[PDB]
Design a protein around this ligand. Structure first.
Ligand SMILES: *[C@@H]1O[C@H](CO)[C@@H](O[C@@H]2O[C@H](CO)[C@@H](O[C@@H]3O[C@H](CO[C@H]4O[C@H](CO[C@H]5O[C@H](CO)[C@@H](O)[C@H](O)[C@@H]5O)[C@@H](O)[C@H](O)[C@@H]4O)[C@@H](O)[C@H](O[C@H]4O[C@H](CO)[C@@H](O)[C@H](O)[C@@H]4O[C@H]4O[C@H](CO)[C@@H](O)[C@H](O)[C@@H]4O)[C@@H]3O)[C@H](O)[C@H]2NC(C)=O)[C@H](O)[C@H]1NC(C)=O
Ligand SMILES: *[C@@H]1O[C@H](CO)[C@@H](O[C@@H]2O[C@H](CO)[C@@H](O[C@@H]3O[C@H](CO[C@@H]4O[C@H](CO)[C@@H](O)[C@H](O)[C@@H]4O)[C@@H](O)[C@H](O[C@H]4O[C@H](CO)[C@@H](O)[C@H](O)[C@@H]4O)[C@@H]3O)[C@H](O)[C@H]2NC(C)=O)[C@H](O)[C@H]1NC(C)=O
Ligand SMILES: *[C@@H]1O[C@H](CO)[C@@H](O[C@@H]2O[C@H](CO)[C@@H](O[C@@H]3O[C@H](CO[C@H]4O[C@H](CO)[C@@H](O)[C@H](O)[C@@H]4O)[C@@H](O)[C@H](O[C@@H]4O[C@H](CO)[C@@H](O)[C@H](O)[C@@H]4O)[C@@H]3O)[C@H](O)[C@H]2NC(C)=O)[C@H](O)[C@H]1NC(C)=O
Lengths: 668, 670
């Protein structure tokens, strides 16, 4: 069903080598290539495999000491682990060419903590300019322990131990099936036993594998601990990107709330109990994931110190706001400019750019890191290498915890407070002389659930014999949200002839009241659907635009088994290649109602100014000097959003078939 | 004996026009001149009759957007309403001459919200130079619903709905009488139906109408959102006026506490419950005010972000104190400099001058604003124009709420922490060479309660017929109010050489709650300025007699608007309403005494008046001296370093005569 890209022979050889490191991630095949290359790899005598000598020797000092042991949980939020992951990434990134890169990777895949390897290896592939174009397995196929609820994981573990189904018919009743000599396990989203509250209404978005992958992808595309100088001109906009990402995400998430009768994201206080608990079905074969009960007191003895830190980190920000202008971190900052937006984002992410340095240093403490440690509820790590995990310890599980949206809602609000310093758009900056939208029409917008498979073979262990054949075929089936394709047609009257930018946004039409939202208090609640350039004709014309073409949404990842078959034909999937860090299509729309749920479609047309000729860290970076989210990057005066080149359309989002996903997983 | 002032027919005309906007405030007379001009008035077409072209256009832009609807409650404490008020004020203030000014008010009365209009208009009349010398009715005549509980209000309403008394004799037992063509309504203070805590002892003060109108006057004279550019060298002393205003008022409040056996205003925490609540019995148009129960948790869900703001505001100040010298707001500040008081006060009020701008902005969040919203215990506003009012949303009701005094005492305490950095005055600074006060003597000081009536007609809605016929002034409210007897202060001064001099008179407590004499060291901020004036000393023996009645810090009671119309037919205007409108009322000068005589003390100070280097007369002739406000008690004191022969401390007692409880004035006789 998917867009393909023709791909030559050199590429296929390289892509295959790359993907082969993601097979049976959790054990070592004594007969696989990677193993022999790892053994043949004298790390000692090959300084000249690397661009950077310092990076080489740095890693060696560390490696003579010792790294995180195999099998333990890896998380980039713990200091010593991060420093080790960064050293290994430096190695991957400074590899002279693809050969040295492969060897290093084989070496690491054999002698190192697998989680740490996967983390570093992912990022390296995305960042190395000679690997820029190659494809990666979806995060749920590489780390399926972070995307599988415990019940399913155990069902698989016991099937492996049994060497298959004793009796097909008991198995069937447990949602276990044979298909083409592969096992398929049906999976429910977790019940009130996992979210002991209203937030369980939404488990089908928060547990969704696309959504969690998406977040993992956004991190790997530009990690907080790294410099953004590789993207040149983009560096001046890093904080802008950080805001936009969370604002969009939270806007999307709030829409799911509204359709499930849920309202505003609750606000919290470090000095008070947090209402909404989280109980994850995940474990690290050592500790189960830390639970957070309902009405959990954040301010208990073990958190006194971290809360102190988080409290000033926030209040320092308030003091910025109060002072208008001030020196911070070298700079003299004036909150009336855009060198400001960037700073503000960088401030809140304590990323490398905030310090003007290449990598985060040992001792520069992160607000997000401690926010997450406090909200995560875990007892304090036992030592350097051993912590008790929580959902907030990983990019791939973060989106599962209600507290995650509460934490980012807090940051995003503080940025909105800053945005009140920004001067609002005027009639002249928004009006498109001689152009008018006369109508917008939209096809029926319909959501629904349907089944989706992935290979979870990575959390299953195989024998020496089986390993010789690199084995898979442990598939998880899950209902996932989705929508039917639709067309937006825009009608435009115009006087003369230029390229135009067409932008589409989705916003709520009413609050939980039933009361119309006014733009003043809604601009933050619009998420972008699309961006494209158009040749405008004199007079009357119609722009037709299908959802399947929307610039900010991707098709589903193919599993490796399918990737391998495409590669066999000279093909790869475009979206996994050209745009992995984009949200999946199926999640484009929030679950509707049979009824039809009322939202609004915002259609913007403005003149196109041919600019930037760049090299993109995200697909959110479109070749335009306008802000991200423009014209909804800042406070609005509602009376300038009546230009003829704007159209707000009421749309209703329908739903079809079963409303509850669990009815998709019932036996006979 | 109401202190008069004569005036010409041109003045009379203008004054009538100003007064018209204060009658029948919530309604419109289709037949009146103001409406005809108002309805039809084209601002854009009259661009050239305004000093400031940008203000006209700023206003036009907002007015095309829509302004607050009629009939909703207006408070300056919310961004959008404030911004509309200010764009309106600017229109009033930049009108080229009176004619344009007048016509603009006409337009604004026709088209804008009543509260927003009255607010802007009142300030305009005070600020406009060509209006200097003109008179405005007391705020209780304009917003009478804000100076009375709902009991009286409902009687007024019932009578109006009936178009009279169905049973004069039954009405009598509710304190309602016809007198002339007036309906007269006796009113109690709220403690007569409500004793929910010890703070209700202080109602005849905190609910007093003059005391409340006085706060409103202070704010209108110089609102926080506006520059003080127009007041000359006041600009360099704004923060000083801010501090002193509250310091004085809190001293006066404190006296009322003392004489009612209550001691010190309690300290609070934005993270803890606040003990004493506030149950308001006022109504507005479509809601009651918000209640704060006792033990209200300031730190609930809804206040999280607010308290984070409030908490950071304070700590920023604390950081200033720790630093001594710092750069902030684009100014180098040194806390050893006594002049820093300008910045300190400006910081706490978050006024326009903190930033050196004409007008404050939404993104410059105010401390006082957010503290008021937190302690008021109202729920989140419904939208930008629909809130639930608490006493602290208005200058005319704030003094009613115990929390009000707790809030400003907190700020004033913080300013006092700054004053710790100031070097105490030495002997040489205070010593008047060759001058000694040899005796002070005071007539008996005695308070009493006494009936006072005001026009409450704006609280009522009138019919078509009545409005046409000007029968629109028939509702009076009578209420016992504190007063004291006039008294003389006799001061015998000795000086070798003749010399021009300043004499200051303060009032202070004698003891704390334990009955230890208060020492200057701890209690120099507990002093209340009663009077200042100059005399000429001569060689030898001097005797200065000063009547309380000539104390310059206080004014006489306002006259009703009704008597001003009568006066204006004689070519007269009430002097104290013209030049002395924003002074504290005279009759509340002394705290309520006790039958046995509660102990206070007078401080009398005499010092040299050799010239007049720096003196204020733009704000008004308050500080005819380059001396700090509240000199010689504007910084901390060391007892030994302080006492000087031209100072004198005299023990006095304040008595009370007649009924001690106001409600005893309001019993019907049988
Ligand atoms: C129970 O509760 C409900 C829900 O809260 C209450 O409902 C509220 O009722 C309000 C009326 O009291 C109402 O507000 C009015 O709505 C009018 C219509 O609003 C629409 O249109 C305007 C402008 O018109 C143009 O719009 C389109 C788009 O360009 C054009 O194609 C059209 O052809 C028009 O040219 C838009 O701006 C709005 O967004 C709406 O879509 C308003 O026009 C009207 O505004 C007037 O009043 C303001 C203050 O009074 C004033 O600032 C403004 O300038 C307007 O002035 C006119 O009206 C006054 C009297 O109001 C008149 O004397 C003047 O001469 C002048 O012509 C109102 O604001 C609320 O919309 C509504 N709330 C909701 C959610 O619907 C309900 O009242 C309440 N009932 C009871 C019994 O309590
Ligand atoms: C302001 O606040 C003050 C303080 O409360 C109010 O004062 C009260 O006013 C009320 C009602 O107007 C007064 O009540 C009347 O008292 C009358 C006489 O004194 C009493 O003698 C009786 C009878 O034997 C004793 O038993 C009592 O203890 C009293 O001392 C009394 O004649 C009268 O009776 C009327 O009402 C009853 C209802 O049961 C009928 O039976 C009877 O026919 C008659 O109609 C009242 O009860 C009350 O005394 C006042 N309070 C105090 C403390 O003295 C003011 O009214 C308030 N002013 C305003 C304007 O609100
Ligand atoms: C994902 O989540 C869904 C929802 O939780 C879950 O669906 C549930 O599945 C169970 C079985 O898997 C199912 O119950 C089975 O129910 C049937 C239907 O029974 C109906 O008719 C009864 C009268 O004849 C009536 O009493 C019932 O209320 C119901 O309407 C029933 O035939 C089965 O009977 C029992 O069989 C078991 C065998 O273990 C015996 O222990 C027992 O003695 C009975 O003979 C059995 O109960 C249940 O109804 C579903 N829940 C809902 C809410 O619809 C999925 O299984 C889960 N899927 C996966 C893959 O995880």
């Amino acid at each position: 069903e998917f867009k393909t890209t023709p791909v030559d022979a050199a590429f296929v050889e390289k892509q295959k080598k790359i993907l082969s490191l993601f097979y049976n991630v959790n054990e070592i095949s004594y007969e696989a290539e990677y193993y022999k290359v790892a053994q043949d790899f004298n790390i000692e005598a090959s300084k000249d495999c690397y661009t950077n000598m310092k990076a080489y020797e740095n890693f060696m000092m560390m490696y003579k000491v010792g790294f995180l042991p195999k099998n333990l949980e890896f998380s980039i939020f713990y200091e010593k682990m991060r420093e080790e992951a960064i050293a290994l990434f430096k190695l991957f990134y400074y590899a002279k060419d693809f050969e040295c890169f492969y060897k290093t990777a084989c070496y690491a895949r054999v002698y190192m903590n697998q989680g740490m390897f996967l983390y570093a290896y992912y990022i390296a592939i995305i960042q190395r300019s000679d690997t820029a174009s190659f494809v990666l397995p979806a995060p749920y196929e590489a780390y399926p322990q972070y995307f599988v609820n415990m019940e399913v994981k155990n069902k698989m573990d016991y099937v492996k131990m049994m060497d298959g189904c004793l009796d097909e018919k008991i198995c069937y009743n447990y949602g276990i099936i044979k298909e083409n000599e592969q096992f398929v396990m049906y999976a429910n989203y977790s019940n009130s036993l996992t979210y002991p509250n209203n937030e369980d209404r939404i488990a089908y978005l928060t547990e969704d594998v696309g959504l969690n992958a998406y977040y993992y992808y956004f991190h790997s595309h530009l990690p907080f601990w790294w410099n953004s100088g590789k993207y040149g001109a983009f560096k001046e906009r890093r904080g802008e990107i950080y805001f936009f990402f969370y604002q969009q995400l939270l806007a999307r998430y709030y829409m799911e709330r509204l359709t499930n009768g849920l309202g505003k994201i609750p606000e919290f206080s470090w000095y008070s109990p947090l209402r909404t608990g989280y109980l994850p079905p995940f474990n690290s074969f050592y500790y189960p994931f830390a639970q957070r009960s309902n009405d959990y007191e954040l301010h208990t003895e073990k958190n006194y110190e971290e809360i102190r830190f988080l409290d000033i980190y926030e209040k320092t920000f308030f003091q910025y706001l109060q002072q208008g202008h001030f020196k911070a971190f070298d700079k003299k900052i004036d909150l009336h400019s855009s060198k400001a937006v960037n700073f503000v984002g960088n401030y809140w992410q304590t990323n490398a750019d905030l310090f003007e340095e290449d990598f985060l240093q040992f001792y520069q403490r992160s607000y997000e890191v401690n926010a997450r440690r406090v909200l995560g509820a875990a007892p304090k790590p036992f030592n350097q290498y051993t912590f008790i995990p929580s959902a907030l310890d990983f990019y791939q599980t973060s989106a599962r915890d209600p507290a995650f949206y509460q934490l980012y809602k807090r940051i995003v609000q503080y940025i909105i407070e800053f945005k009140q310093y920004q001067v609002p758009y005027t009639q002249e900056a928004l009006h498109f002389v001689g152009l008018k939208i006369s109508d917008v029409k939209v096809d029926k917008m319909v959501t629904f659930f349907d089944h989706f498979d992935f290979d979870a073979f990575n959390t299953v262990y195989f024998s020496k014999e089986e390993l010789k054949s690199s084995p898979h075929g442990y598939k998880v089936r899950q209902p996932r949200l989705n929508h039917k394709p639709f067309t937006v047609t825009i009608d435009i009257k115009s006087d003369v002839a230029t390229n135009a930018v067409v932008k589409m946004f989705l916003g709520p039409k009413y609050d939980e009241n039933g009361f119309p939202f006014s733009l003043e208090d809604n601009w933050m609640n619009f998420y972008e659907l699309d961006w494209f350039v158009q040749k405008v004709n004199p007079g009357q014309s119609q722009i037709t635009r299908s959802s399947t073409d929307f610039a900010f949404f991707k098709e589903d990842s193919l599993p490796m088994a399918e990737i391998y078959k495409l590669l066999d034909q000279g093909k790869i999937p475009t979206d996994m290649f050209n745009s992995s860090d984009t949200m999946p299509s199926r999640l484009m729309l929030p679950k509707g109602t049979y009824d039809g749920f009322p939202f609004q479609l915002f259609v913007f047309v403005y003149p196109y100014e041919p600019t930037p000729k760049e090299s993109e860290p995200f697909k959110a970076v479109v070749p335009d000097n306008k802000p991200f989210g423009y014209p909804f990057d800042r406070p609005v005066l509602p009376q300038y959003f009546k230009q003829p080149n704007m159209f707000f359309k009421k749309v209703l989002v329908y739903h079809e078939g079963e409303l509850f996903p669990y009815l998709f997983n019932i036996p006979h | 004996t109401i202190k008069t002032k004569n005036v010409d027919a041109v003045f009379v005309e203008k004054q009538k026009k100003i007064l018209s906007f204060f009658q029948d405030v919530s309604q419109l007379n289709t037949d009146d001149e103001y409406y005809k001009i108002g309805k039809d008035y084209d601002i854009e077409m009259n661009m050239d009759n305004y000093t400031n072209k940008k203000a006209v256009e700023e206003f036009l832009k907002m007015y095309r957007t829509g302004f607050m609807p009629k009939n909703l409650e207006f408070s300056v404490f919310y961004d959008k309403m404030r911004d509309e008020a200010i764009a309106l004020f600017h229109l009033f203030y930049y009108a080229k001459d009176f004619e344009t000014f007048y016509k603009t008010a006409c337009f604004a009365r026709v088209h804008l919200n009543q509260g927003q209009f009255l607010y802007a208009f009142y300030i305009a009349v005070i600020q406009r130079s060509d209006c200097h010398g003109f008179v405005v009715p007391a705020p209780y005549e304009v917003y009478p619903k804000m100076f009375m509980n709902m009991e009286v209000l409902q009687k007024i309403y019932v009578t109006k709905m009936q178009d009279g008394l169905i049973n004069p004799e039954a009405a009598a037992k509710y304190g309602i009488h016809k007198e002339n063509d007036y309906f007269v309504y006796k009113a109690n203070y709220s403690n007569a139906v409500l004793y929910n805590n010890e703070e209700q002892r202080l109602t005849y003060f905190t609910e007093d109408i003059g005391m409340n109108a006085y706060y409103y006057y202070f704010h209108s004279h110089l609102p926080f959102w506006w520059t003080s550019e127009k007041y000359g060298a006041l600009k360099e002393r704004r923060g000083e006026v801010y501090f002193y205003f509250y310091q004085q008022l809190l001293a006066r409040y404190y006296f009322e506490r003392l004489t009612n056996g209550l001691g010190k205003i309690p300290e609070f925490s934005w993270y803890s419950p606040i003990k004493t609540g506030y149950y308001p019995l006022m109504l507005t148009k479509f809601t009651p005010f918000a209640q704060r129960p006792d033990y209200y948790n300031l730190h609930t869900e809804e206040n999280y972000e607010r308290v984070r703001f409030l908490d950071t505001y304070e700590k920023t100040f604390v950081q200033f104190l720790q630093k001594d010298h710092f750069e902030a707001f684009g100014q180098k500040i040194d806390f050893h400099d006594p002049k820093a008081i300008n910045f300190v006060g400006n910081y706490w009020q978050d006024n326009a001058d903190l930033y050196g701008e004409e007008v404050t902005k939404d993104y410059q969040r105010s401390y006082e604003v957010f503290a008021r919203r937190v302690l008021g215990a109202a729920p989140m506003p419904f939208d930008k124009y629909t809130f639930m009012p608490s006493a602290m949303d208005f200058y005319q009701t704030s003094l009613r709420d115990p929390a009000f005094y707790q809030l400003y005492n907190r700020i004033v305490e913080y300013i006092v922490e700054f004053k710790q950095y100031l070097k105490p005055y030495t002997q040489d600074k205070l010593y008047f060479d060759g001058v000694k006060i040899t005796d002070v003597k005071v007539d008996k000081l005695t308070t009493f309660f006494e009936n006072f009536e005001f026009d409450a007609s704006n609280s009522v809605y009138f019919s078509k017929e009545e409005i046409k016929n000007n029968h629109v002034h028939d509702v009076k409210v009578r209420q016992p109010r504190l007063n004291h007897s006039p008294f003389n202060v006799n001061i015998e001064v000795d000086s070798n050489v003749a010399s021009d001099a300043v004499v200051k008179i303060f009032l202070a407590p004698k003891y704390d709650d334990n009955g230890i004499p208060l020492t200057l060291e701890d209690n120099w901020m507990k002093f209340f300025e009663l009077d200042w004036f100059t005399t000429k000393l001569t060689a030898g023996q001097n005797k200065i007699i000063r009547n309380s009645n000539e104390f310059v810090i206080f004014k006489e009671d306002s006259v009703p608007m009704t008597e001003i119309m009568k006066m204006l037919d004689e070519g007269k205007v009430p002097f104290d309403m013209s030049e002395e409108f924003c002074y504290m009322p005279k009759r509340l000068m002394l705290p309520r005494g006790t039958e046995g005589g509660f102990p206070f003390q007078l401080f009398v100070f005499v010092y040299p008046f050799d010239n007049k280097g720096k003196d204020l007369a733009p704000f008004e002739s308050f500080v005819l001296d380059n001396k700090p406000l509240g000199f010689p008690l504007d910084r901390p004191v060391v007892d030994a370093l302080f006492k000087v022969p031209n100072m004198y401390f005299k023990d006095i007692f304040i008595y009370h005569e007649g009924e001690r409880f106001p409600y005893k004035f309001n019993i019907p006789s049988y």
